[PDB]
Symmetry: D2
Subunit: 293 residues, 4 copies
C-alpha cells in the first residue's frame, strides 16, 4: 500500500530498463485486448518500439518478422530478446539472452539454446493481467494492478505440483498421433492401476494452457507426429520461454528425445515438439515414449 | 448516442435486468481483483430483491428457494448461478402464494435468459422471445453496450467440446460420436477439440464459433452433472433463440419439467447439424 | 449489498429519468477525464439520454436557443433544464426537474419558478465524480464508483453549516459592484466586531464553488455587473437548481430582492444575480442589502 | 499508440531516470488514493518509500517531517529530493531534485542549495485527469497520466507562459494584513489607471492548481510578505523553489519582491519565502509598485 512491491523493485534487487519497457508494452497490449490480425501487428510494433527504446537490446526476434531485427547502434544494449507479442490470436511470451559473441550483432546471437536464457516468462491477458517471470533464482508471479499501472508481486518462488490430475492437448488430431502419445493418453483415461482418471482441459491458446498447468499441475502436450515431425510450436519464442519457466518452477519440458532447453537451434523460426508440466507426469510420458523407441 | 442494455430492453422486467447488470458489474470487478461465490450470491440476491420485480429466487448456493418479502415482491422468478468464470440466469413470470414450486417451470416458459462471461472484457448475452443480443461492458462508462444484434449460430461447426478425461465412463453413443469426430468416415477433415472446463466459456465459444458442447449422461451419472434450472435451461434458451439446438439426448432441455430445483440434466447443445448428427448416433446406441 | 442512486430513488417516470441522466453523467465524466467540441458532445449525450428515458416532454439547455419538444412517442411528464458542461481544472453538470403542470408541451412548461422543482442537483467532475441530488426530503451525495459504474450513496441528508468562514466571488469586478456588495465584502476582511476575517476562495466554475460552499459553509456571490446588468448566471439551469440544493440543505439563496426560487421566469435563458450559502452569512448580506435600499 | 511517448522515454532522451520512474509510481498511487477517498501521511510514506527504493537518492526533505531523512548507505545515490507529497490537503504533489554537492556524509545541509541549482522540478495535479509538469535544464514539458496503460504520456513540449495575463490570484481575505504595495497592486488590477479592462480574480486555495492555471492561461500568483509574516507563508524548498524553477523555465518570473526566489540561499529546510510569480509583464508591474514602497 505505502510500500508498493513492483516488478521494477523486485528486479532491481540494463535488464531493469529492458523489463520496464516490456511491462509498458504489456500494459498497452492488455488495454487493447480489453477494448476489442490487426492486433497482432500492432502488438508487435509496440513491443519492438518499446524494446528498442530501452537502450538494452541489440537483436530482436519476433514471430511476425522473417529475419531478426538488428537494433540501431545508438540504441543498442547487450541483450537479445525473442518474443511472441500476441500468442493465441491470449498472451505475450518472451525470452531474454545475453549476447555472447563479441562481433557485430547478427541473427546468430539469437541461436542460443534455452539453457542460456537470462530471463523468460509470459503475460496472460484475462480478467486480470498476470505476468510470470522466471530468472535464475526461480519463478515469480506479478499481477497488473490497473489502479496504479504497475505489476505487483503476488506469488514468490512458484513451484509446480509434483504430480497433476489434468492433461492438455488437442485430441481432435488423434488420427495423427504417434503411437507413444496415443498410449500415454489412453493411460490417463483408462488408468491400468485403477486410480482416478485425469480430467482433460484444452483452452487452445498456449499461454492459458501452460499457465493452468503451472498453477494446478498436470501436463501439456503439443507433440510431434509423422505429419508435423518437429511439432508446431516455435522453439525460440514459445517453447524455450515456457520450458525455462517450467524448469525453474521444478517442472520439466521435453521434446520427447531431449530437454527443450538443450535443443541447439539453426533457424530462428524452427518448430519443436513440447511436452511439459509436473515432473511425474512428464516422466510418465518419457517412459511411454522410450517404450516405443 | 449510447445504446445500452436498458434502452434495448425498454424498446417489471427492465428494473429486474438493471439490478442484475449492477450485480454483474460488481462481480466482474471482484473477479478482476482476485468465498468469492458466496459474495457473488449475496450480490445477486440483494440486487434482485431490491428491484421490486421478483418473488422467488433460486440459486446454486441455497438449498431452498428464497421467497421475497411482500414489501419488495414482484412478478418474476429468477434462477441463477452467480459464479459458474461467468454468471448464468433464467427469468420466468410467476403463475397463488409465491413458493418454491413457482420455479419448477419448463425452460419453454422462459421470458429471458443469458449469461455474463468475465474475461479481458465482460460480455453479456441476453436472449428473449425475439432473439439473442450481445452486450459488452464498457468500463469507462459502466454500461452494457449493444455490440452484436440478433446473433445466430453456424449451421455446422468444426469444434467438439467435452471432458474426454471421463471417456472410460462414457455412454457408447458418446464414444461413437467422438470417434466419428476424430476419424471421419466420409473422408472429411477431423474436428478440433476445445474444453475450457467452464460452462459459460465453452458455451460462449460454441455460440460464436459454432460446433457442439456435451455434458452427457452415462450410467454412473444418468442425469448428467449440470443443473437444469440455472445452468442447462438458460443455456438451452440462448442456443434455441440463436437457431441452434439443446437436447438431453431424449428430448429438448427446454421441455424437461423439473420436480426439484437442484435436479441435474444431460446437455448436448450447439450447431444444429452437429446436434442432429449426435442424435442420429444416439438413436442406434444407448 | 450496494446502495446505488437508482435504489435510493426507487425507495422514495422519475427513476428512469434519473437513470438515464446518470448514464450521461458517467459518459461526460469519461470524456472530461480523457480530454468547445466537448460542450456540444455533452449536450448531445444528455439530450439523447433524456429523450430515450420516455420520461420527459420539454428539454431546456444552455446549448439550444429554444426549448426542445420531445417527439410524441417518447414523451413523459417531466421537464428538464440543464447545463451539460458548466464551467467549460473544474467542470460539472447542473440539472433541474419539473412536472409539466396542461396542454401540448412547449417552451412555457419550462417557465416555472424554482419553488416548483421536483428534483435538482449537479455532478462535479474531479478526481472523483460526485453527484449531489436534492428532492423534497433533503440533499444526498453520491460518488461514482468507477469499478462498478454506479453512483453510490456516500452522504445522507446533507446540511450546510449555519455559519461559514469563506466568501466566494470574482472580486475583479469590484469597480462594478453596487454599494451593498462592496460593504458586505469589506465586512468580511475588516470585521467591525473584532472577529477573525474570512478567507476568500473562487475557483471560477459555479459547480465547484457551490459544492465547496455546501461542504464547508460560507457564502457564494455572483452579483450583477456592468457587462452583466441582470446578472451572469442562468436562472433556469444554474441558479434555480443550486438554490434548491441550498434550501434543501438548510441554506439560503437570494437575488437580493427575493428568493431565487420565487423568481417567476419569462425567458428560458434569462439571467439572475445570486447570493447563496450558509444562512447566517446570507442573512448578514441581506441586512446590508436592506440598509442600502 | 504503437510508439508510446512516455515520461521514462523522454527522460532517457541513468540514476535520474530511476528516480523519476519511482516518483511516477508514487504519483500514480497517490492519484488513485485521492480518487477513492490521513491521506497526507499515506502520500508521504509512498513518496519516501519509492524514492528510497530507487537507489538514486541520499537526502529526502518532506513537508511532513521536521527533519531530513538520510537514505541508508545500501540504497544511497547522488540526488537530494525536496517534496510536498499532498499539497492542498484540488490537490497536488510538488518536488525539487538537486545533485549532492559535497564529499561529506549526506546530511540536512545537502538540501540547503539555492533553487538555481535544481536539476529537475515540477508537480503533479490530481484532477479528472492527472497531469505531471516537469521542468529541467532544457525547458518545461507536460505529461498526462494515461490510466488505460498507467503511464505518463507527453502532451505538450517546451511550455511557455503568456507574456501578460488577465487574472490575478491571491487570498484577499487577508487584506487587513497586506503590505501597502500589495494593497496598491491589487487595487490597480480592479481599477486600472490606463482604462484597460480590469483583471479577473481566481483563487482555488491549492498552490498546485493556482500555479498550473497561471502557467496555462497567464497572469499572476501572489503569496507575499507582510508585517506579520516577513518571509511569506509558503515554504522555499518544496513549494516556492520548484514552482519558481518551473516558471523561469517557461519564460515567467518568480520573485520574493527583493530577489529571485531561485537565488535565495536557505539556512533551514522548512524556512518560508514570499513568492510572486507568473507572466513577466505582470510580475514586473508588481515589482514596480513594490519598489515604490
Amino acid at each position: 500500500d505505502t510500500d508498493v512491491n513492483t516488478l521494477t523493485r523486485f528486479v532491481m534487487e540494463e535488464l531493469t530498463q529492458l523489463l520496464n519497457s516490456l511491462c509498458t508494452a504489456v500494459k498497452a497490449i492488455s488495454s487493447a485486448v480489453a477494448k476489442a490480425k490487426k492486433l497482432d501487428v500492432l502488438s508487435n510494433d509496440l513491443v519492438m518500439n518499446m524494446l528498442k527504446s530501452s537502450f538494452a537490446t541489440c537483436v530482436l526476434v519476433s514471430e511476425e518478422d522473417k529475419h531478426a531485427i538488428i537494433v540501431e547502434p545508438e540504441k543498442r544494449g547487450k541483450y537479445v530478446v525473442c518474443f511472441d507479442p500476441l500468442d493465441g490470436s491470449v498472451g505475450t511470451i518472451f525470452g531474454i539472452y545475453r549476447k555472447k559473441s563479441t562481433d557485430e550483432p547478427s541473427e546468430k546471437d539469437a541461436l542460443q539454446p534455452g539453457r542460456n536464457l537470462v530471463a523468460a516468462g509470459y503475460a496472460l491477458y484475462g480478467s486480470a493481467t498476470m505476468l510470470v517471470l522466471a530468472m535464475d533464482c526461480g519463478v515469480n508471479c506479478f499481477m497488473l494492478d490497473p489502479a496504479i499501472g504497475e505489476f505487483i508481486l503476488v506469488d514468490k518462488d512458484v513451484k509446480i505440483k509434483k504430480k497433476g490430475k489434468i492433461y492438455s492437448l488437442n485430441e481432435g488430431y488423434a488420427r495423427d498421433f504417434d503411437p507413444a502419445v496415443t498410449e500415454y493418453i489412453q493411460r490417463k483415461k483408462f488408468p491400468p492401476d485403477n486410480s482416478a482418471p485425469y480430467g482433460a482441459r484444452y483452452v487452445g491458446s498456449m499461454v492459458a494452457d501452460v499457465h493452468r498447468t503451472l498453477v494446478y499441475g498436470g501436463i501439456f502436450l503439443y507433440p510431434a507426429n509423422k505429419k508435423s515431425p518437429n511439432g508446431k510450436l516455435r522453439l525460440l519464442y514459445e517453447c524455450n520461454p515456457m520450458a525455462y519457466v517450467m524448469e525453474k518452477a521444478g517442472g520439466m519440458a521435453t521434446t520427447g528425445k531431449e530437454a527443450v532447453l538443450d535443443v541447439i537451434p539453426t533457424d530462428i523460426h524452427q518448430r519443436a515438439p513440447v511436452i511439459l508440466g509436473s515432473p511425474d507426469d512428464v516422466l510418465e510420458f518419457l517412459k511411454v515414449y522410450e517404450k516405443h523407441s
